[PDB]
């Protein structure tokens, strides 16, 4: 009875996997360019911090602490880029599978929501790379400048950078999702100050999910989520 | 548990007691149990 | 789960749907359930 639908899932997953593989090939063909794009803020921050240190006194750089670390980082970056470029095909197949499983009243919501979410995710990633990362990296490296030497390794930096980019994309999508919902009489200010009690618990559960078992990481991930919820309250208040 | 520790469980419990409080804790746990029982009902229906 | 993540579960499920497919997925799941029930029967027999 699941047969007429398992064939479609198989075929669409095959197309999505093929798209991801082609994207991985195209990305690994240009892994140097993507790696330079990723590492440009780090190099700029290190050069600026070196300038500050030389000014004060009158080194640190990007390293690799694993033998296969550079190759693994290149593969990871190429895989992430392949997923990102295959996301059009992936979401096309996913919607085509879920479309004849949704009533004729949820498509009209899901399409503009998905489109606006994608645009705001792109805007957030660009904002993080160009306006946040240059200042944040400089502040973080200058923080441990008079005590430690910044021998920054690429393996952890890649994960840190991707996490920042994805988090900023989501932090740009949530306050636009709030506006979109508030347009259609769905959530109002009162509706947002009455489910706050469960909202903070859900926020902390999400922080526990997306961070290592460390408590401090959970709190440091829950605080920006709380700020985004507070901003959402104002947005739905002035909607 | 997929990168999740016991201390995190304790922190979420602390938040739950603090913000929900005397009431809205029993109600929240009751509704979470009801939702989980409904999920189990769905998986039982699938396994039929 | 001993160095195992959820995304890995998803990759294994994708492989299972891709390679087994329409048939041999229900059969494989049925046989895995049968083997687990047999293991439980063995541990029940041990506890006697």
């Amino acid at each position: 009875s699941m047969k007429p639908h398992l064939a479609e899932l198989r075929q669409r997953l095959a197309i999505s996997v093929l798209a991801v593989f082609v994207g991985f090939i195209i990305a690994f063909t240009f892994h140097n360019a993507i790696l330079g794009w990723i590492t440009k803020p780090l190099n700029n921050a290190l050069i600026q911090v070196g300038k500050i240190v030389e000014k004060r006194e009158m080194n640190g750089m990007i390293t690799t602490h694993q033998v296969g670390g550079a190759f693994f980082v290149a593969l990871k970056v190429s895989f992430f880029a392949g997923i990102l470029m295959a996301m059009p095909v992936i979401l096309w197949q996913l919607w085509l599978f879920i479309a004849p499983g949704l009533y004729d009243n949820e498509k009209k919501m899901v399409l503009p929501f998905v489109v606006g979410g994608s645009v705001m995710f792109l805007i957030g990633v660009l904002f993080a790379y160009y306006v946040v990362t240059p200042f944040g990296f400089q502040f973080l490296i200058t923080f441990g400048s008079f005590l430690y030497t910044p021998l920054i390794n690429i393996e952890d930096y890649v994960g840190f950078f991707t996490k920042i980019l994805i988090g900023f994309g989501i932090a740009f999508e949530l306050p636009v999702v709030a506006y979109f919902l508030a347009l259609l009489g769905l959530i109002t200010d009162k509706t947002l100050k009455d489910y706050f009690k469960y909202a903070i618990v859900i926020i902390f559960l999400l922080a526990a999910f997306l961070t290592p078992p460390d408590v401090l990481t959970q709190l440091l991930m829950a605080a920006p989520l709380i700020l985004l919820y507070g901003l959402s309250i104002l947005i739905v208040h002035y909607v | 548990m997929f990168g999740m520790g016991f201390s995190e469980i304790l922190v979420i419990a602390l938040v739950a007691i603090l913000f929900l409080g005397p009431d809205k804790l029993p109600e929240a746990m009751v509704q979470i149990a009801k939702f989980f029982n409904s999920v189990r009902k769905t998986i039982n229906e699938a396994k039929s | 789960m001993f160095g195992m993540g959820f995304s890995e579960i998803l990759v294994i499920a994708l492989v299972a749907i891709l390679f087994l497919g329409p048939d041999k997925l229900p059969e494989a799941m049925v046989q895995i359930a049968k083997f687990f029930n047999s293991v439980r029967k063995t541990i029940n027999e041990a506890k006697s």
């Binding site: 009875s1 699941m2 639908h5 879920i98 004849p100 499983g101 949704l102 | 997929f2 989980f36 999920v39 769905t42 998986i43 229906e45 699938a46 | 959820f6 579960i9």
Partner: peptide
């Protein structure tokens, strides 16, 4: 079996794999 039941049950087993 219809598609909506498929999505329901798939989401259910996905949740069960995260408990």
């Amino acid at each position: 079996m219809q598609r909506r039941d498929f999505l329901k049950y798939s989401v259910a087993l996905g949740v069960a794999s995260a408990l």
